[PDB]
Amino acid sequence: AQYEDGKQYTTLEKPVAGAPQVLEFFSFFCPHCYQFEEVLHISDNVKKKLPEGVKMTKYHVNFMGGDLGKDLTQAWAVAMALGVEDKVTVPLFEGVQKTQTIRSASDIRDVFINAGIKGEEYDAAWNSFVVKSLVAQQEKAAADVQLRGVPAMFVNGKYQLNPQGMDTSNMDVFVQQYADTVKYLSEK
Amino acid sequence: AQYEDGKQYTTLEKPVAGAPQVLEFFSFFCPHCYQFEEVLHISDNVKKKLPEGVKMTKYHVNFMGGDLGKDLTQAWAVAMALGVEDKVTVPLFEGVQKTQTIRSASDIRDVFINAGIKGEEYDAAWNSFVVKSLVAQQEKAAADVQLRGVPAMFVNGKYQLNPQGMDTSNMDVFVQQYADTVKYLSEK
């Protein structure tokens, strides 16, 4: 409905150049990101309200989970390259945070194999040039907006969402407000 | 020379007389504290490696979260007086960091009642002087060590763990390295 800069969103002094239309950052170690995905379905609700020709991009960050977070960023690149994001997102969140079955990189491989991906294919993707590019692209994107925390969502590389300034008293209302704000800004 | 001052631990320039053997400080607002607790299980692992008769004390701090921060230090004192720590640690961490449904002192009270503590029993403890002394004790302890950040762990009032000098590629190895250092310092 009604939008106020500094309230439901903020503006970047340095508006990132070829930033994706809608860009989301997260970490598999991030508790609130897990809430966003499994309970609220923030990305799905945003997607439903996005106008024609607006795509969403989701990137993983290295700054949580120490050395393992970096491997998770590479595994996220593999998921995108193989297009199995929807098959592995929740299993990876659960593996790191719930069942705690992911304690090293080898455990990540097992999640993919369990989803029906051949190990040879995973290993080849992992060491691919497409994947090294995706990894660098992800790290660059985070650098560009000087990201310091997750979850985070940016629109046109110009605006940053601010759930802090949104009505969180009712979660169904909150989710729609977040989606409407993304829509409002994308057409701005 | 396998364990060095400045490496896996630091020696207090001002030792603390009568300080608990193993003293840990945390905050429900602190992110690495959520990691340390819910994913790494640092306390449990450290506990599993201590000699007999070596007791562990965990205290909450005031310096994060402002108003709610102090309310949580009082709530922790209530958990300690009632002996329900294991019942509320997880929902408090999740309430504050994952769902972000903990916004006032009544929200904290809801977690306890949901955990099985009777309202009358919680309210009585909340207002007690026993809880007041427990709050003072936590504050005095942070002051004795000039605590400026969390998570933190001190041994024999003389040393402070320094997890910065340990590999994080494997969580299990990190956890055992941390636990072995504590054991070492406790018998040092």
CA dist B20 → A156, B72, B156, B157, B182 (Å): 54, 22, 6, 7, 13
Residue-wise DSSP of A95-130: IIIIS---SSHHHHHHHHHHTT--HHHHHHHHT-HH
CA–CA separation, A26 and B40 (whole Å):
20
Instruction: Report cis status (omega within 30 of 0) of the bond before A151.
Output: yes
Q: List residues in chain B that are followed by a break over 2.5 Å (C to N).
A: none
Our CA-based measurement puts residue A20 at a distance from the nearest CA of chain B, in whole angstroms, of 27
B25 beta partners: B59, B152
A57 beta partners: A23
Closest CA to B185 of B146, B144, B154: B154
B56 beta partners: B22
Q: Beta strands A152-155 and A159-161: pairing type?
A: antiparallel
Instruction: Retrieve residue A136's tokens.
Output: 């660098």
Treating both helix axes as pointing N-terminal to C-terminal, what angle do A119-126 and A105-114 enclose, rounded to 10 degrees? Answer: 130
- Contact criterion met (CB below 8 Å) for A85 and A58: yes
Q: Name the 3-class secondary structure at B84.
A: coil
A155 beta partners: A22, A159
Instruction: Retrieve residue A149's tokens.
Output: 């925390």
Edge-to-edge strand list for the sheet holding A159-161: A9-11, A159-161, A152-155, A22-26, A56-60
- Contact criterion met (CB below 8 Å) for B60 and B67: no
Residue A57, judged by CB atoms within 10 A of its CB (0-12, 13-18, 19+), counts as middle
Query: Does residue A66 sit at the B interface (CB-CB below 8 Å)?
Result: yes
CA dist A3 → A20, A51, A173, A175, A183 (Å): 22, 18, 15, 15, 11
Residue A172, judged by CB atoms within 10 A of its CB (0-12, 13-18, 19+), counts as exposed
- Contact criterion met (CB below 8 Å) for B55 and B23: no
CA–CA separation, A120 and B105 (whole Å):
53
Which among A35, A71, A104 is the nearest to B98, CB-wise? Answer: A35
Residue-wise DSSP of A25-37: EE-TT-HHHHHII
> In chain B, at which residue ranges do the beta strands (DSSP E only) sit?
9-11, 22-26, 56-60, 152-155, 159-161
> In B86-145, at which residue ranges do the beta strands (DSSP E only) sit?
none
Sign of CA pseudo-dihedral B145, B150, B154, B158: negative
Kindly report the number of other CB atoms within 10 A of residue A163's CB atom: 19
Residue A125, judged by CB atoms within 10 A of its CB (0-12, 13-18, 19+), counts as buried
Query: Does residue A100 sit at the B interface (CB-CB below 8 Å)?
Result: yes
Q: What is the DSSP letter of B115?
A: T
Which residues lie below 8 Å from residue B27, measured CB to CB, with a gap of 6+? B33, B60, B61, B63, B64, B65, B69, B72, B150
Contact state of B168 with A100 under an 8 Å Cβ cutoff: no
| One-letter amino acid for residue B98 of the chain | K
Which H helix or E strand runs over B15? none
Residue carrying structure tokens 């989803």: A115
CA–CA separation, B186 and A2 (whole Å):
59
Edge-to-edge strand list for the sheet holding B56-60: B9-11, B159-161, B152-155, B22-26, B56-60
Q: Domain-by-domain residue ranges, chain A?
A: 1-188
CA–CA separation, A41 and A45 (whole Å):
6
Contact state of A103 with B38 under an 8 Å Cβ cutoff: no
Instruction: Retrieve residue A66's tokens.
Output: 């120490």
At the topology level, CATH places domain A1-188 in Glutaredoxin (3.40.30)
- Contact criterion met (CB below 8 Å) for A178 and A32: no
**Using DSSP, how many helices (H) and how many strands (E) does chain B show?**
8, 5
Kindly report the number of other CB atoms within 10 A of residue A3's CB atom: 13
Collect all residues of chain B within an 8 Å Cβ-Cβ radius of residue A35: 98-100
Closest CA to B43 of B54, B58, B30: B58
Residue carrying structure tokens 């402070």: B160
Instruction: Retrieve residue A114's tokens.
Output: 């369990």
B26 beta partners: B60
**Using DSSP, how many helices (H) and how many strands (E) does chain A show?**
8, 5
Sign of CA pseudo-dihedral B7, B12, B18, B23: negative
CA–CA separation, B144 and B146 (whole Å):
6
Record the resolution, in angstroms: 2.0
Q: Name the 3-class secondary structure at B55.
A: coil
Query: Does residue A112 sit at the B interface (CB-CB below 8 Å)?
Result: no
Way the structure was solved: X-ray
